[PDB]
Design a protein around this ligand. Structure first.
Ligand SMILES: O=S(=O)(O)O[C@H]1[C@@H](O)[C@@H](CO)O[C@@H](O[C@H]2[C@H](O)[C@@H](O)[C@H](O)O[C@@H]2CO)[C@@H]1O
Length: 138
């Protein structure tokens, strides 16, 4: 797959589904994001924005974009990616939250703010190369 990636999630999200992304963080990475998006029209809401950042104290930001407004960020001040390194990034969709697992290590649980059933698309962009994106347990 090529970037930017913005593709429908076959069948939409359901509890029990996993999204499995294999990629390589750029040697020159500043940020990348994975968005679970409600639609494909301009101005679409983002149910879940997952955003690793190397600018400053390395961290991952988690948020929702609704009605053109970013919500209150959740943040984890740990960086599970490494510049130039391949990663395995998994989102397990559960009733209460998205469970994020990186390279086998549980990383975060982001509580649903928009109903998960409204998500139609996965969008990925930023400073990485993608090897694959797979939807499991749909
Ligand atoms: O690429 S973007 O989606 O435009 O980047 C935005 C997102 O990463 C959101 C996620 O919350 O953050 C925005 O920046 C925030 C910044 O993290 C925060 O420290 C500051 O207080 O507010 C900014 C604007 O909401 C990104 O612009």
């Amino acid at each position: 797959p090529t970037l930017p990636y913005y593709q429908p999630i076959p069948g939409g999200l359901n509890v029990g589904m996993s999204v499995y992304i294999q990629g390589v963080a750029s040697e020159h990475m500043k940020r990348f994001f994975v968005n679970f998006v409600v639609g494909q029209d301009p101005g679409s809401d983002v149910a879940f924005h997952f955003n690793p950042r190397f600018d400053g104290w390395d961290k991952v930001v988690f948020n929702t974009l609704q009605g053109g407004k970013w919500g209150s960020e959740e943040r984890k001040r740990s960086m599970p990616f490494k510049k130039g390194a391949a990663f395995e990034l998994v989102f397990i969709v559960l009733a209460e939250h998205y469970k994020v697992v990186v390279n086998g290590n549980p990383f975060y649980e982001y509580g649903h703010r928009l109903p998960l059933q409204m998500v139609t698309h996965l969008q990925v962009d930023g400073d990485l190369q993608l090897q694959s994106i797979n939807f499991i347990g749909g």
